[PDB]
Write a protein that binds this DNA or RNA. Structure first.
Ligand SMILES: [K+]
Ligand SMILES: [K+]
Ligand SMILES: [K+]
Ligand SMILES: [K+]
Ligand SMILES: [K+]
Ligand SMILES: [K+]
Ligand SMILES: [K+]
Ligand SMILES: [K+]
Ligand SMILES: [K+]
Ligand SMILES: [K+]
Ligand SMILES: [K+]
Ligand SMILES: [K+]
Ligand SMILES: [K+]
Ligand SMILES: [K+]
Ligand SMILES: [K+]
Ligand SMILES: [K+]
Ligand SMILES: [K+]
Ligand SMILES: [K+]
Ligand SMILES: [Mg+2]
Ligand SMILES: [Mg+2]
Ligand SMILES: [Mg+2]
Ligand SMILES: [Mg+2]
Ligand SMILES: [Mg+2]
Ligand SMILES: [Mg+2]
Ligand SMILES: [Mg+2]
Ligand SMILES: [Mg+2]
Ligand SMILES: [Mg+2]
Ligand SMILES: [Mg+2]
Ligand SMILES: [Mg+2]
Ligand SMILES: [Mg+2]
Ligand SMILES: [Mg+2]
Ligand SMILES: [Mg+2]
Ligand SMILES: [Mg+2]
Ligand SMILES: [Mg+2]
Ligand SMILES: [Mg+2]
Ligand SMILES: [Mg+2]
Ligand SMILES: [Mg+2]
Ligand SMILES: [Mg+2]
Ligand SMILES: [Mg+2]
Ligand SMILES: [Mg+2]
Ligand SMILES: [Mg+2]
Ligand SMILES: [Mg+2]
Lengths: 123, 170
RNA sequence: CGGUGAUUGGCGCAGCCUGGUAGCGCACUUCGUUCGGGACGAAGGGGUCGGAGGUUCGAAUCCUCUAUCACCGACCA
RNA sequence: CGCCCGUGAU
RNA sequence: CUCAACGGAUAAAAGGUACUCCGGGGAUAACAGGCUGAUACCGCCCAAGAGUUCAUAUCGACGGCGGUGUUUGGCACCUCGAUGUCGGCUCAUCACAUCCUGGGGCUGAAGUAGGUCCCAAGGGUAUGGCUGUUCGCCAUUUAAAGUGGUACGCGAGCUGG
RNA sequence: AGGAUGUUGGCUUAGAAGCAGCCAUCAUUUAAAGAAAGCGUAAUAGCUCACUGGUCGAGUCGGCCUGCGCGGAAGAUGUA
RNA sequence: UACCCGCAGAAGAAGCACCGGCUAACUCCGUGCCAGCAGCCGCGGUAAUACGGAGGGUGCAAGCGUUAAUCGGAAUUACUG
């Protein structure tokens, strides 16, 4: 349940450490982005020699939220913080080469099979 | 002023070098001096293009402090505002004449830039940038561009340029 | 927008009130002085008055309209 | 009493 | 006696008030209404041309004729024994000169994407940075971020920059 | 049904044969036919037209003056 | 294998840098403050031993030059001095 001004950690190794959400894409008057939802971000702090510089405007996909995903039988999976993976602005393909931490099975789609393979653990 | 004048003279632009026993040197030494000729044609200076309302968009709004106007140009995209008088018609008139000034100065600024550009393109009147030598000691003239010699300097110095113009007209 | 005053030689200025004659400084031209330049000394030329129309025997001058510039005001809700 | 200046070839 | 304010008030006279006060006036302004419609906006008529040729796919000069009430105005009919002002918030409602979605004609319409005109008002029709702002510029969205009337809708509903 | 010939009339263009545009614009055969009114082509070609016969068997054509109508004709609470 | 013997035949086997002064070794032609050279001083602006080629020289030689880097020369950090 990510909205504008929400600060997200970064699950890949693009260089960024913190990003801010500046728009939830995909509809008019759309409030929240959950796991699997593309967002427009801006970079608020980066590591000194990454691929992305502080102040960039990019896309990202949410992979962990602490609101959680609800499964078909009624279960819930919640994490301790919100995280996202940085995407190229046009192709919408991952920028980094590694993923940290677990991801979930709501990314199992034709777009994000690159992320599922790299994830240490899929729940 | 003549017919086909610039065609004949356009090949003279450049630096001319003179070698000669100096009369301004007390020791009577041999010196080299340079001067430059630059030839450009007369232009028709057409800036008679005026405001065509087909390509003017005008907005009237309420003053910041609906008397304020905001004129903008459709193709150039340069806007103009005025909030001088309480009548908008006074403001509306003042802006388009101000708009006229704004259009006009782009044309002037565009022509001012290309003049400085050709000022940068001109060679300095100094060593090495010569195109003709006029060494009057041994009475030799050499256009080092074509390159046509001559041993009759006095005739050249009086207007026998027919030797050089035609050959320089490659 | 109105309103009050200016346009005179290449440049900076008088003359207009109160009609009949345009003047000054610098600059310019020639000569002299100096080896030469500047400074200096002696001669000389150049403007029909922003434009236009009126009044008058006569207009830079008086009147009216214009163009450009400068100053000033545009105030209460 | 007042008197400034003299470019660049090797 | 330029008593020229020329039927001449005294021989002899300038200003400030946002610190203000009284008697009055919608006889007279400022806001909104009204009448009008020069201006503004929308439409149409003629067609010189531009569009390789080809006025009329799309534009259309020099000129002409209307509509709306819709900007800036003109007037002074209402209100001065009072009709609270810009913007924001809340809540709206109508028109259609249609922004999207729907249906069509022509195209300088191969397709995708467009241009332009006709019909259509059922529903829908952004969030932020700056600034008191409406507006505007900018960032990023959206199928689209319509144009207007309603005392420039709305203070006995809120605020008060 | 037919609606020709010299002749791609002259100039420039790349092209100008009708058509970017410029000057004009005769002759021959019947019956009629153009240095072309129109669409198309780059030019062609082609498709028209103007023009004349055969059929058909009563009217037909487009101007002027006039009467009454049609379009031009879109707004906000509700027909109005 | 090192070495030794036999065969044939001058046969298979020379370049690089310099030549104004310092520094050993010079003349002609081309160019004309250009093109170019250069460690320092400096050469080229119409008779260039200094640029470029040619002839001739000089020095090293299976190498010869250039660049980098150290000490010497430098008594120019001097204890000697
Ligand atoms: K009086
Ligand atoms: K007083
Ligand atoms: K005060
Ligand atoms: K009101
Ligand atoms: K009306
Ligand atoms: K109309
Ligand atoms: K009208
Ligand atoms: K009142
Ligand atoms: K509304
Ligand atoms: K309608
Ligand atoms: K539609
Ligand atoms: K259409
Ligand atoms: K609708
Ligand atoms: K503004
Ligand atoms: K109140
Ligand atoms: K209010
Ligand atoms: K009330
Ligand atoms: K010592
Ligand atoms: Mg006059
Ligand atoms: Mg001096
Ligand atoms: Mg000297
Ligand atoms: Mg009186
Ligand atoms: Mg009172
Ligand atoms: Mg009244
Ligand atoms: Mg008003
Ligand atoms: Mg009013
Ligand atoms: Mg009215
Ligand atoms: Mg045309
Ligand atoms: Mg009004
Ligand atoms: Mg009255
Ligand atoms: Mg009223
Ligand atoms: Mg009352
Ligand atoms: Mg409609
Ligand atoms: Mg602010
Ligand atoms: Mg209101
Ligand atoms: Mg109320
Ligand atoms: Mg307050
Ligand atoms: Mg306040
Ligand atoms: Mg109705
Ligand atoms: Mg020589
Ligand atoms: Mg040497
Ligand atoms: Mg030592």
């Amino acid at each position: 349940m990510i909205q504008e001004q929400t600060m997200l950690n970064v699950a890949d190794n693009s260089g960024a450490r913190r990003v801010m959400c500046i728009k939830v894409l995909g509809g008019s008057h759309r409030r929240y982005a959950g796991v699997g939802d593309i967002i427009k971000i801006t970079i608020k702090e980066a590591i000194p020699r990454g691929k992305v510089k502080k102040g960039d405007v990019l896309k990202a996909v949410v992979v962990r939220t602490k609101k959680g995903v609800r499964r078909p039988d009624g279960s819930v999976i919640r994490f301790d913080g919100n995280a996202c993976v940085l995407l190229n602005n046009n192709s919408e393909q991952p920028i980094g080469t590694r993923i940290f931490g677990p991801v979930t099975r709501e990314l199992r789609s034709e777009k994000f099979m690159k992320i599922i393979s790299l994830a240490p653990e899929v729940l | 002023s003549g017919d086909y004048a610039y065609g004949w003279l356009r090949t003279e632009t450049g630096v001319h070098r003179l070698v000669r026993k100096s009369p301004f040197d007390s020791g009577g030494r041999r010196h080299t001096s340079f001067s430059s000729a630059f030839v450009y044609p007369e232009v028709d200076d057409d800036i008679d293009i005026e405001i065509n309302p087909a390509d003017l968009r005008i907005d009237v709004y309420r003053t910041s402090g609906e008397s304020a106007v905001r004129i903008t140009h459709i193709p150039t995209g340069i806007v103009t505002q005025c909030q001088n008088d309480r009548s908008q018609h006074k403001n509306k008139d003042q802006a388009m004449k101000q708009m006229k000034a704004k259009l006009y100065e782009l044309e002037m600024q565009k022509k001012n830039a290309e003049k400085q550009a050709m000022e940068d393109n001109k060679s300095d009147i100094g060593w090495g940038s010569q195109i003709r030598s006029y060494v009057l000691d041994d009475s030799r003239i050499k256009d080092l561009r074509t390159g046509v010699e001559t041993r009759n300097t006095q005739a050249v110095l009086d207007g026998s340029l027919d030797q050089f113009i035609e050959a320089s007209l490659k």
